[PDB]
Design a protein around this ligand. Sequence first.
Ligand SMILES: Nc1nc2c(ncn2[C@@H]2O[C@H](COP(=O)(O)OP(=O)(O)OP(=O)(O)O)[C@@H](O)[C@H]2O)c(=O)[nH]1
Ligand SMILES: Nc1nc2c(ncn2[C@@H]2O[C@H](COP(=O)(O)OP(=O)(O)OP(=O)(O)O)[C@@H](O)[C@H]2O)c(=O)[nH]1
Ligand SMILES: [Mg+2]
Ligand SMILES: [Mg+2]
Lengths: 415, 180, 180, 137, 18
Amino acid sequence: SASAVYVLDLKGKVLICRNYRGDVDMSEVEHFMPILMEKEEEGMLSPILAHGGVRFMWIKHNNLYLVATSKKNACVSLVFSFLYKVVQVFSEYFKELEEESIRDNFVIIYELLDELMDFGYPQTTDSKILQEYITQEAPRPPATVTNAVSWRSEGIKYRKNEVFLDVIEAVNLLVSANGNVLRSEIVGSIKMRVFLSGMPELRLGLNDKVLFDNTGRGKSKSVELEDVKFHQCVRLSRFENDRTISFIPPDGEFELMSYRLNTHVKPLIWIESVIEKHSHSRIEYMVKAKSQFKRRSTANNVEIHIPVPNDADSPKFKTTVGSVKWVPENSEIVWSVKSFPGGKEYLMRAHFGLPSVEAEDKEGKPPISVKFEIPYFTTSGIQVRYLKIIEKSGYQALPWVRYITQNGDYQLRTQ
Amino acid sequence: GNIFANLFKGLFGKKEMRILMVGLDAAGKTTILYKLKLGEIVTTIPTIGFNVETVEYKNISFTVWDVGGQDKIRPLWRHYFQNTQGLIFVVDSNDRERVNEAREELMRMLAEDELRDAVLLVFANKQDLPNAMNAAEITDKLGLHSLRHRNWYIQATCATSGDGLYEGLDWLSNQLRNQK
Amino acid sequence: GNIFANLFKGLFGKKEMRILMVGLDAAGKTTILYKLKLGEIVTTIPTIGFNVETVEYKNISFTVWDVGGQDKIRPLWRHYFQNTQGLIFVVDSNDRERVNEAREELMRMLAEDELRDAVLLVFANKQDLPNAMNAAEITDKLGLHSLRHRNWYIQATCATSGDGLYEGLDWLSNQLRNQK
Amino acid sequence: SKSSVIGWPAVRERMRRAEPAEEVGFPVTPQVPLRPMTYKAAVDLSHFLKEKGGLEGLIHSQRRQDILDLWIYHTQGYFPDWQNYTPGPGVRYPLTFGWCYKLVPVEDPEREVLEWRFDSRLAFHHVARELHPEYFK
Amino acid sequence: DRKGGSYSQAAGSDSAQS
Ligand SMILES: Nc1nc2c(ncn2[C@@H]2O[C@H](COP(=O)(O)OP(=O)(O)OP(=O)(O)O)[C@@H](O)[C@H]2O)c(=O)[nH]1
Ligand SMILES: Nc1nc2c(ncn2[C@@H]2O[C@H](COP(=O)(O)OP(=O)(O)OP(=O)(O)O)[C@@H](O)[C@H]2O)c(=O)[nH]1
Ligand SMILES: [Mg+2]
Ligand SMILES: [Mg+2]
């Protein structure tokens, strides 16, 4: 229940503001910057600010803080969801999120803000629906918003019915300094870019453990996602009733389902680091990377980031496979490898000097993270069974899907 | 099919072979691998991860994958156990307290069904002080003579001197390659 | 790439080399550095900080960074240890009480992993009185013969006379440069 | 299917070698479609196995069934889930409709000896579906 | 070709589930 949502700037200037209830004065935005500065200097800065009896909830955007001032005890989660929807709509309409587009599309930006929410209650949240009624280059509102199906616009015609799916896998491993993995969770991502004619109702079917157990086929390799979230077009009733993933696919790229469950398998890449750091004399980087993934899968664009000393200079890299580049801005050395086949063993030996004068304050030990991304690999083993594409007119669809395995929160605690 | 190309390759030498570098920390495994690859006693930081190197001798490139004896790196030796044909254990005769730990690690490594075709390779590291044992006391303490179905040989090699590395390499080649 | 410019530079002499000036106070280190740079016995105040000078001999500019033996300046020698290729220790054979302090300072300087490529350079300073020891007694007392992996040579040089400085410079050049 | 005919003898030999009673990851062939075996496809596979032999009368085993399913998936891309047996005790009907192969006793359900037997009526009669309507949805 | 895994054809439903 934010009183007014406004877009700020890096210098405190409000790029654009739009009051929705009028219960909060527009002059409260000026005091938001001093409050944020005081909070940052004291460690008490939070996204939800508080200016007396009015709370100024702000979200750190790409270039401006989306401050949504509120007065009463409005839904904080609702305000955050509205801000996220507004950010997504702006990203869809404008490819750049900065001051260049804030002051360049004000005529359409004001109309979009007015149409999105009224009296603090959001009304329009579909990017396609908003673009079909408000454009920067007006007819009556589309019937899709009024109709029940607000995620599948009717009347869409295409020459070919091709849908491109993406089995995105995020391998996150939380390995402590002792060598044991604490947080090892893999989050699935079933995103399909449906581009067909009409409003087909997708019938999602995969090798789900629950579905296999219900059907009596709980003996093969089935993916048991701890948390499964359906898309907006996905009908929750069918999933709760018999796990039937039946919903109208959206026009374009959208996230249908996103699995999320813990992983009990060995890490895809095993990286062991050795720190032979002398006392203000030199530093040793005994970094050894072992590929725990299958040899048939290659980790393309593998970049194992090893944090080097903050004051370290004149470093020498003695590795075997993969180029090592030291970035002064990042204050770390990334063991970048173009192609990392499974089972490969890469050994590196870093050596650099240190300044004679000791550092005044400590810099910490940031965890070492790798950027391995091996496509065409299904670590979870979940295989899609079928995709029920049904249309009233009747057409032969040719859906496609690709499985991509990447490294997410794969951070290894430093020694 | 025709095997003329294989015969031509084998006439001038085609066999390479493999080897493993495992053992307790500070047992000369890294020094042994450096001597096998380079041939000098170079001081290096402890092997937090693993060291990969290859040594060419007798027309065979016996690649050795050095593995540290650290607690965080001891369980990582299973990653190199896949597609591995040899296994070399680094003993620390000068570390009586760590002798039991090294023996336990060797028994754990040899107690795996996957590591069955790799013969035992025990090198009496730290053979530079009078406290170092002989080639029979170390084997008796480690119980290598009771390891049936494993070609384990006790060899004394000093990292500083380099003597005994050739004997160990020859023993490993004989265990792996059984040709003329 | 082309190394024609490097060969042309080396044909007429391009190597310079480096050197260090360390030792106990009143040990002739400042006098030795002045003789190397200028060549005269000039009286100077104690080196509270450090003295920087360069000497060109045999087509090599062996720069010597003189360091005082003061208590407040003894720990400051670590600043010059960075990017240093040589190390020269100034001994005081006429200071029996300070001989132990000089030996301890030399051992502390040589007991650092950073100062490993610099060979030992011990100059028998104060070689003008009968109380000065020979080139073997000073080395035996300082234990330079037991310093393995270090090219330490004992040379007797008198600041007032200037004899023996050429021998020490030649020894340092031979230790650093190993060419024709 | 020349590839299927070639793989049938090797699959039969592997099944016979395995008694009746190392690499991690899940690699996937690029561009190879994956879908469950159809009723017509299951019937064709059962007929081919019966004609070539090695499937009817063979002692049913978990290892042999897994090897056969893996060979079928490699040869045609069919998921190794349609070659399921009906719950015991007794003769287990094919899990997927259209399958002409079923497991019947040859003498705890696990200790019972099962043998693969051809069943033409299985492809036309949903005996497994009738026995377990809940499992059929 | 495309990085991250080539696109593969998808079925319509579980043919073995009837
Ligand atoms: N100086 C010396 N060290 C020896 C000798 N024999 C064995 N060593 C040991 O060899 C070690 C060499 O260290 P590394 O190169 O790291 O190889 P490592 O023994 O496997 O140690 P890690 O790599 O950390 O597992 C030294 O720490 C010594 O403890 C010897 O004869 N002389
Ligand atoms: N008069 C004389 N002094 C000598 C002789 N040999 C060594 N010395 C010493 O050399 C010292 C010269 O002083 P400095 O020029 O300051 O050099 P230093 O000995 O390193 O003293 P600090 O620079 O303060 O560390 C004198 O104090 C003497 O103690 C010598 O033969 N005759
Ligand atoms: Mg090592
Ligand atoms: Mg001086």
